[PDB]
Design a protein around this ligand. Structure first.
Ligand SMILES: [Ca+2]
Lengths: 174, 61
Protein backbone atom coordinates (compact mmCIF):
# COMPACT_ATOMS: atom_id res chain seq x y z
CA UNK A 1 0.00 0.00 0.00
CA UNK A 2 1.30 3.43 -1.00
CA UNK A 3 0.61 6.48 1.15
CA UNK A 4 0.56 10.01 -0.25
CA UNK A 5 0.62 12.80 2.32
CA UNK A 6 0.29 16.58 2.51
CA UNK A 7 0.46 18.25 5.91
CA UNK A 8 -0.87 21.77 6.43
CA UNK A 9 0.70 23.67 9.32
CA UNK A 10 0.41 27.07 11.02
CA UNK A 11 2.99 28.63 8.72
CA UNK A 12 6.67 27.79 8.38
CA UNK A 13 9.85 29.22 9.86
CA UNK A 14 12.30 30.75 7.38
CA UNK A 15 15.15 30.82 9.90
CA UNK A 16 16.49 27.91 11.93
CA UNK A 17 14.07 25.04 12.35
CA UNK A 18 11.22 25.50 9.87
CA UNK A 19 9.01 23.61 12.33
CA UNK A 20 10.12 25.25 15.59
CA UNK A 21 7.34 27.28 17.16
CA UNK A 22 4.82 25.95 14.66
CA UNK A 23 2.15 23.24 14.79
CA UNK A 24 0.24 20.94 12.46
CA UNK A 25 -3.35 21.96 11.72
CA UNK A 26 -4.50 19.53 9.02
CA UNK A 27 -3.49 16.03 7.97
CA UNK A 28 -4.49 14.77 4.54
CA UNK A 29 -3.38 11.38 3.28
CA UNK A 30 -4.68 9.20 0.46
CA UNK A 31 -4.28 5.45 0.05
CA UNK A 32 -3.15 3.97 -3.26
CA UNK A 33 -3.26 0.22 -3.82
CA UNK A 34 -2.39 -1.41 -7.15
CA UNK A 35 -2.32 2.01 -8.85
CA UNK A 36 -5.94 2.58 -7.84
CA UNK A 37 -7.67 4.67 -5.20
CA UNK A 38 -9.11 2.37 -2.53
CA UNK A 39 -10.95 5.23 -0.88
CA UNK A 40 -9.20 4.64 2.43
CA UNK A 41 -8.29 8.31 2.76
CA UNK A 42 -7.13 9.71 6.08
CA UNK A 43 -8.35 13.26 6.57
CA UNK A 44 -8.21 14.72 10.08
CA UNK A 45 -7.81 18.16 11.64
CA UNK A 46 -5.60 19.16 14.55
CA UNK A 47 -5.32 21.93 17.12
CA UNK A 48 -3.26 25.00 16.09
CA UNK A 49 -2.33 25.83 19.71
CA UNK A 50 -1.51 29.27 18.34
CA UNK A 51 -2.61 31.75 15.69
CA UNK A 52 -2.53 30.86 12.00
CA UNK A 53 0.17 32.60 9.98
CA UNK A 54 -1.06 35.51 7.78
CA UNK A 55 0.55 34.04 4.67
CA UNK A 56 -0.85 30.55 5.29
CA UNK A 57 -4.31 32.07 5.70
CA UNK A 58 -4.22 33.59 2.22
CA UNK A 59 -2.90 30.33 0.75
CA UNK A 60 -6.06 28.25 1.22
CA UNK A 61 -8.17 29.94 3.90
CA UNK A 62 -8.02 28.47 7.41
CA UNK A 63 -9.17 30.07 10.66
CA UNK A 64 -8.10 29.18 14.20
CA UNK A 65 -11.72 29.08 15.35
CA UNK A 66 -12.25 26.15 12.97
CA UNK A 67 -9.58 24.00 14.60
CA UNK A 68 -10.88 24.66 18.12
CA UNK A 69 -13.23 21.69 18.57
CA UNK A 70 -11.01 19.48 16.42
CA UNK A 71 -8.66 17.04 18.27
CA UNK A 72 -4.92 17.57 18.73
CA UNK A 73 -1.97 15.50 17.52
CA UNK A 74 -2.04 13.69 20.87
CA UNK A 75 -5.51 12.26 20.19
CA UNK A 76 -4.45 10.76 16.85
CA UNK A 77 -0.79 10.02 17.58
CA UNK A 78 -1.10 6.22 17.61
CA UNK A 79 -3.91 6.36 15.05
CA UNK A 80 -1.79 8.13 12.45
CA UNK A 81 1.34 6.22 13.46
CA UNK A 82 -0.20 2.81 12.72
CA UNK A 83 -1.67 4.17 9.49
CA UNK A 84 1.74 5.03 7.99
CA UNK A 85 4.08 2.75 9.96
CA UNK A 86 5.88 0.35 7.64
CA UNK A 87 4.78 2.04 4.43
CA UNK A 88 5.98 4.29 1.62
CA UNK A 89 5.60 7.99 2.34
CA UNK A 90 5.29 9.98 -0.87
CA UNK A 91 5.39 13.69 -0.05
CA UNK A 92 6.37 16.89 -1.86
CA UNK A 93 9.35 18.42 -0.04
CA UNK A 94 9.39 15.68 2.60
CA UNK A 95 11.83 17.77 4.65
CA UNK A 96 8.90 20.06 5.44
CA UNK A 97 6.15 17.59 6.40
CA UNK A 98 8.42 14.98 8.01
CA UNK A 99 10.14 17.75 9.96
CA UNK A 100 6.81 18.82 11.42
CA UNK A 101 5.69 15.24 11.99
CA UNK A 102 8.79 14.29 13.97
CA UNK A 103 8.53 17.64 15.76
CA UNK A 104 5.04 16.83 17.04
CA UNK A 105 6.16 13.29 17.90
CA UNK A 106 8.91 14.61 20.18
CA UNK A 107 6.41 16.97 21.83
CA UNK A 108 4.52 13.88 23.02
CA UNK A 109 7.61 12.87 25.03
CA UNK A 110 6.94 9.19 24.30
CA UNK A 111 10.50 8.42 23.12
CA UNK A 112 9.05 7.98 19.64
CA UNK A 113 11.92 7.70 17.11
CA UNK A 114 12.03 9.66 13.86
CA UNK A 115 9.46 8.65 11.24
CA UNK A 116 12.32 7.84 8.85
CA UNK A 117 13.24 4.86 11.05
CA UNK A 118 9.94 3.03 10.54
CA UNK A 119 8.75 4.58 7.27
CA UNK A 120 10.28 4.92 3.82
CA UNK A 121 10.34 8.67 3.21
CA UNK A 122 10.52 9.49 -0.48
CA UNK A 123 10.26 13.04 -1.82
CA UNK A 124 8.37 13.60 -5.06
CA UNK A 125 10.04 16.98 -5.57
CA UNK A 126 13.40 15.25 -5.92
CA UNK A 127 11.95 13.05 -8.65
CA UNK A 128 10.37 16.01 -10.42
CA UNK A 129 13.64 17.95 -10.13
CA UNK A 130 15.45 15.11 -11.88
CA UNK A 131 12.79 14.86 -14.58
CA UNK A 132 12.43 18.61 -15.14
CA UNK A 133 15.73 20.31 -14.18
CA UNK A 134 15.41 24.05 -13.76
CA UNK A 135 11.67 23.99 -14.30
CA UNK A 136 8.91 24.91 -11.84
CA UNK A 137 8.02 21.65 -10.12
CA UNK A 138 5.41 22.90 -7.69
CA UNK A 139 2.20 20.91 -7.20
CA UNK A 140 0.15 23.38 -9.25
CA UNK A 141 2.90 23.35 -11.88
CA UNK A 142 2.91 19.57 -12.19
CA UNK A 143 -0.89 19.63 -12.02
CA UNK A 144 -1.15 21.85 -15.09
CA UNK A 145 1.67 19.90 -16.76
CA UNK A 146 -0.16 16.56 -16.53
CA UNK A 147 -3.49 18.29 -17.20
CA UNK A 148 -4.92 17.73 -13.74
CA UNK A 149 -7.52 20.08 -12.29
CA UNK A 150 -6.92 21.18 -8.70
CA UNK A 151 -9.37 24.08 -8.81
CA UNK A 152 -12.74 22.40 -9.37
CA UNK A 153 -12.28 19.84 -6.62
CA UNK A 154 -14.68 19.50 -3.70
CA UNK A 155 -11.84 18.43 -1.43
CA UNK A 156 -10.48 21.55 0.25
CA UNK A 157 -7.28 21.69 2.28
CA UNK A 158 -4.48 19.15 2.64
CA UNK A 159 -6.74 16.42 1.28
CA UNK A 160 -6.87 18.36 -1.98
CA UNK A 161 -3.10 18.45 -2.37
CA UNK A 162 -2.77 14.83 -1.26
CA UNK A 163 -5.21 13.71 -3.95
CA UNK A 164 -3.43 15.77 -6.60
CA UNK A 165 -0.01 14.54 -5.49
CA UNK A 166 -1.26 10.96 -5.75
CA UNK A 167 -2.37 11.50 -9.34
CA UNK A 168 0.93 13.20 -10.19
CA UNK A 169 2.90 10.44 -8.45
CA UNK A 170 1.13 7.70 -10.40
CA UNK A 171 1.50 9.68 -13.63
CA UNK A 172 5.27 10.01 -13.26
CA UNK A 173 5.67 6.38 -12.24
CA UNK A 174 3.22 5.25 -14.89
CA UNK B 1 -18.69 11.31 2.08
CA UNK B 2 -21.64 13.16 3.57
CA UNK B 3 -19.59 14.70 6.37
CA UNK B 4 -16.86 15.52 3.86
CA UNK B 5 -19.05 18.36 2.60
CA UNK B 6 -20.22 19.15 6.12
CA UNK B 7 -16.68 19.52 7.48
CA UNK B 8 -15.87 21.96 4.68
CA UNK B 9 -18.84 24.09 5.72
CA UNK B 10 -17.28 24.57 9.16
CA UNK B 11 -14.02 25.56 7.48
CA UNK B 12 -15.55 28.32 5.36
CA UNK B 13 -17.86 29.46 8.17
CA UNK B 14 -14.76 30.13 10.28
CA UNK B 15 -13.75 32.94 7.93
CA UNK B 16 -16.39 35.16 9.51
CA UNK B 17 -14.36 35.17 12.73
CA UNK B 18 -11.33 36.65 10.96
CA UNK B 19 -13.47 39.79 10.61
CA UNK B 20 -12.36 40.73 14.14
CA UNK B 21 -8.88 40.98 12.68
CA UNK B 22 -9.39 42.58 9.26
CA UNK B 23 -5.69 43.45 9.04
CA UNK B 24 -5.27 41.05 6.14
CA UNK B 25 -7.26 40.52 2.90
CA UNK B 26 -10.29 38.44 3.85
CA UNK B 27 -13.35 38.37 1.59
CA UNK B 28 -16.24 37.87 4.01
CA UNK B 29 -18.66 37.80 1.08
CA UNK B 30 -16.71 34.99 -0.58
CA UNK B 31 -18.03 32.53 2.00
CA UNK B 32 -21.55 33.59 1.02
CA UNK B 33 -20.88 32.19 -2.44
CA UNK B 34 -18.80 29.17 -1.41
CA UNK B 35 -21.54 28.07 0.99
CA UNK B 36 -24.65 27.03 -1.01
CA UNK B 37 -28.24 27.24 0.26
CA UNK B 38 -28.25 23.45 0.79
CA UNK B 39 -26.29 24.05 4.00
CA UNK B 40 -27.76 27.37 5.14
CA UNK B 41 -29.39 25.65 8.10
CA UNK B 42 -26.01 24.28 9.19
CA UNK B 43 -24.23 27.54 8.35
CA UNK B 44 -26.70 29.47 10.51
CA UNK B 45 -25.62 27.58 13.62
CA UNK B 46 -22.01 27.53 12.40
CA UNK B 47 -22.03 31.32 12.62
CA UNK B 48 -23.21 31.25 16.23
CA UNK B 49 -20.60 28.67 17.22
CA UNK B 50 -17.86 30.60 15.42
CA UNK B 51 -18.82 34.12 16.54
CA UNK B 52 -18.54 32.98 20.15
CA UNK B 53 -15.21 31.31 19.41
CA UNK B 54 -13.53 34.48 18.13
CA UNK B 55 -14.35 36.06 21.50
CA UNK B 56 -12.12 33.63 23.41
CA UNK B 57 -9.84 33.12 20.39
CA UNK B 58 -7.82 30.13 21.58
CA UNK B 59 -7.02 30.09 25.31
CA UNK B 60 -5.04 26.99 26.24
CA UNK B 61 -5.07 27.22 30.10
CA1 LIG C 1 -1.18 21.14 1.06
Amino acid sequence: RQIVLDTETTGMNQIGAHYEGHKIIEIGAVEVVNRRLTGNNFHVYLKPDRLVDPEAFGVHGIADEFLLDKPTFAEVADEFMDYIRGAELVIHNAAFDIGFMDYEFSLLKRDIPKTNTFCKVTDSLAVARKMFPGKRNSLDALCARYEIDNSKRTLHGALLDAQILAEVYLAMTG
Amino acid sequence: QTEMDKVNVDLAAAGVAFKERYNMPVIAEAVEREQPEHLRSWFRERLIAHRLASVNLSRLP
